[PDB]
Structure formats: C-alpha cells, structure tokens
C-alpha cells in the first residue's frame, strides 16, 4: 500500500504473477507528480520528449510512489536535475547526458551560455512543504523482453508432481499444453529441453 | 457547452435522438479528472478494476464535467471515498459496500 500509480502496457498486472520472460530491465528516476503521465508510450510532454521516451510497441509496467521523506531537504533540493531543452526528441530508450549549451534562437552559443543560450539541465527544488503537483516521486519502469530463447524470468508458483499416465494440462518452463506424458527410448540432445 | 467529456461507445450521439430503447440506466459518481479516462470499456486501472467496471458489450454514453466549484472545500472535502484494495477484480456492473 505504497504505490500511487501502477500501470501495464502489453500485459495485465493481475495475470503477471504467473508469466515467464527472457529478461526484464528496470529504469529508475525521480520526477514530479504531474510528470507521471508523461511516462507512457505515445504520450507527449517535456519529460516524454527530452528525458524519457518509450516505443509505440513498448511492453512493460510503470510504478510510482511518493519519495519526499528521503529525497527532500528543508532548504530545497538541487541534487536532482532534468533536461529542459533538446535539439530533437529522444529516440526510444535513449539516454543523454550531454551538457552542451542549447540555442533557442539565432545567436550561436559557441560553447558559452548567453541570451537564448542556456544550460540544458534544470534543477527541481524539492521542499518538504512543496505542493503535491511538484512533490518528488520515485518511479521504476519494468520493461519486459521475450525472445526465441529459453525464458530465465519465472514466477514463484510451486511445481506439481508428475502425473504421468493420465490426461493432464502441463506447463514445463512456460511451455504449456494438454496431453498425456509417458517415457520413451527417445535419446535427446543433451543440452536443450524439449 | 457544459460538459468537458462526452464519449459515446457503440452508438453515435448525433443519431441518438432517433433511437428507441428498452430502458436506460444512468450511473453517477465523482472522480478526479485525471482518472476520467478510466471510465471506458476495456480499460485497466484501480478505479475500473475495483469500483466501476463496464462490459465489453457496453452500448452507451459517458459524460464527465468539472465540479470544483460544487464539490470542493477550503479545508478539504473528504465526503467522497473510493475502494483501494479488493480480494479479486470487480465484475461488470457490480457494487460492494
């Protein structure tokens, strides 16, 4: 009972407890409350366009919670920065740490800030009494990855006994089906499963 | 011009003046604007999953309009509640107390 937002794209959270996957990546960052909606595929916004971008065919989940108690200071926090100006919208799953000045007009920055030539990063300024709209939120996005390879991400369900000589429904390492299982002389390749 | 969102599923509002029906069920509640999108068939979310679930065969209209001037208090209105947890997902057109 600590997550304010828990969304899923390409999969249902209710049934996620019993699915198998090849890999999953976790992307962690701190953003203000109103910026949670920006974290989605196809959404538009400052964060969505300059900081974090998700593909149209994204398959994963997004989780957010309030982290004021640990990521705020009485006099304001400036240790967390986010990009505000971008030459072009980031490609999906693209990370940029460039500090090069950005040109918002005709004057060339020439590597020096100035009129319409500013740093691309802006601080947040989190304060304990800061409003909910700007209160800091810790956000983790779990991107799932499935391939034509054995799945290494598994659920916690306990395996069942091998009901062998009867009609059953079976699930071996995510390979599901229905049938009756029996032994055979079949000599198998000694390295892969089925 | 008094409704922010007027979305019709399975029927067009323009032609609705020339249609007949057996009965009409008008449902009413209040939610925050950001969650208004959750009131739609085939949507996943806490509000829809545990409070108000619409059927896939839904055929009707949804009208959402701001009520800040009528459902807000200086000290903070708390008369409006909502379920946050449940043993299982809520079935279409179901209510629990």
């Amino acid at each position, epitope marked *: 009972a600590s997550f304010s937002t828990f969304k899923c794209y390409g999969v249902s959270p209710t049934k996620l407890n019993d699915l198998c996957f090849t890999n999953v990546y976790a992307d962690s960052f701190v953003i203000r409350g109103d910026e949670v909606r920006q974290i989605a595929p196809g959404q538009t916004g400052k964060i969505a366009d300059y900081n974090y971008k998700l593909p149209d065919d994204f398959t994963g989940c997004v989780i957010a919670w309030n982290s004021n*108690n*640990l990521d*705020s*200071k*009485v*006099g*304001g926090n400036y*240790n967390y920065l986010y990009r505000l100006f971008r030459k072009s919208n980031l490609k999906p799953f693209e990370r940029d740490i460039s500090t090069e000045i950005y040109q918002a007009g005709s004057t060339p920055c020439n590597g020096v800030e100035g009129f319409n030539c500013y740093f691309p990063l802006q601080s947040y300024g989190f*304060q*304990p*009494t800061n409003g909910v709209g700007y209160q800091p939120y810790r956000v983790v996005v779990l991107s799932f990855e499935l391939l034509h390879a054995p799945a290494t991400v598994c659920g916690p369900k306990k395996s069942t006994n091998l009901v062998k000589n009867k009609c059953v429904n079976f699930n071996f390492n995510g390979l599901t089906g229905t049938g009756v299982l029996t032994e055979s002389n079949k000599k198998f390749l000694p390295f892969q499963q089925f | 011009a008094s409704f922010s969102t007027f979305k019709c599923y399975g029927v067009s509002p323009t032609k609705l003046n020339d249609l007949c029906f057996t009965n009409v069920y008008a449902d009413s509640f209040v939610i925050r604007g950001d969650e208004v999108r959750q009131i739609a068939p085939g949507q996943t979310g806490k509000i829809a999953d545990y409070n108000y679930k619409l059927p896939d065969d839904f055929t009707g209209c949804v009208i959402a309009w701001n009520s800040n001037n009528l459902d807000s208090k*200086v*000290g*903070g209105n708390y008369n409006y509640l909502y379920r946050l947890f449940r043993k299982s997902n809520l079935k279409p057109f179901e209510r629990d107390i």
Partner: antibody
Amino acid sequence: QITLKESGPTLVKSTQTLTLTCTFSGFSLSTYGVGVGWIRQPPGKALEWLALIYWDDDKRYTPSLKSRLTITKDTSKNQVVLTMTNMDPLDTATYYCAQHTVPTIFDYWGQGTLVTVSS
Amino acid sequence: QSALTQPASVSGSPEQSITISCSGTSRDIGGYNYVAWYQHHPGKAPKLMIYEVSNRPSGVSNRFSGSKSGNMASLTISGLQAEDKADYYCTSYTTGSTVVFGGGTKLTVLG
C-alpha cells in the same frame, strides 16, 4: 547506541569569535539521509534553530544569521566545528547539536553547552 | 500567525486521559501535513512523540495520539503517571522554508 557530546569553553567575550566542537560516535556522517545541525535556547524562551549540514556537504543556514554562522566538518575526525562572529551579550544561552533526518527533526540531541557573552 | 498555539499548562488526575490542544492556521497546520508534538522533561533534552499527524512514536508508549483537525491538533495523552510531569511543544513546517515551534506547555499530575 548513538552517542553525542559537545566541547569548548563556556565563557565568551563580546565581539570575539565563538568556537564550539560537537563530537559524535556510533555512526558515520557520510551516510545518505544523515546530517548534523545546531540549535540554541535562551532561558525562558523557545529554542532558536541556527543551521545544519547534510551528508553531502550542502550546508544550509537560517536567513537571519547567515552572515554570522559558519560550520566545518570532517567524517574522519568524528566531530564538527561551529563558529560565530561578533558575539553579543544576548547570545547567552544553551547550545545543542543533533542529528538531522527529515521528518524526525533532530531525532537525537546532545547534552548541550552553557554559553555566556560578557566582558 | 507564524507561530503555533499552546496553552499555559495542563494537569489531571492520575491514570486519567486528557488532551493538549495546539492551534494555528491552514497555512501551516491542518491544511498541511508534517505537524509534530514534543515532550520536554525540564533540564533534559526533549524527545519526539508525534511526528506527522497522529502516528505512534518511534520508540515510546502508545498512550499518546494526534488529531487531524482542519486547523487544530490534539495530543491525547492517557494514563497519567509521575514520570509524565513535563513541558510540551508544538512544531510544524512553515509555508516558507522555515520551521517554527509553539508557545510551550506545562503538564503535572496533581500530586
């Protein structure tokens, strides 16, 4: 058990520079979410918060005394030093250092030190 | 008002329950979270009792409790004992980047 103490003379001269040491043990100050701050209390009145420093050296001060407060630190020493300028007889009060982590404002205090400004 | 409110003193019969009242404005109390109460044994360093609104404390008894009034706050201390004799304080975070205490409070057990 988080141990906290202070050190330094209790008698001060007006217009001099005040210097105090605050010692600690049982924990490291470099840890995230842990800082050390100060607060003074004149007799009969409510306490008077002075300043504080976070783990990341992002020192901070109250506006009304910024020109006067100064705080120096080092984890290896296991103590902190607080200095002030232009002592005034009204500064006579009891000082106290403490460990700061929001929202448990100054969870653990020291014993404090009596200070008086008088020539 | 930038400083919260407290009364002159308080006291009751032993093993009793009674509420210390703290007051202010929605600008700093009631309309904002992070209200806190404090106890102060004279001559000794105060200790935290309530930290956000009415939460059970870090490491002490649960006879204390807070209130969620739109503008008020109440430390309801139950079961008065000889130890409880002490002063009390009310503190919260200001709308600006500053923290304010209260006006003080006294508590005795009508010995």
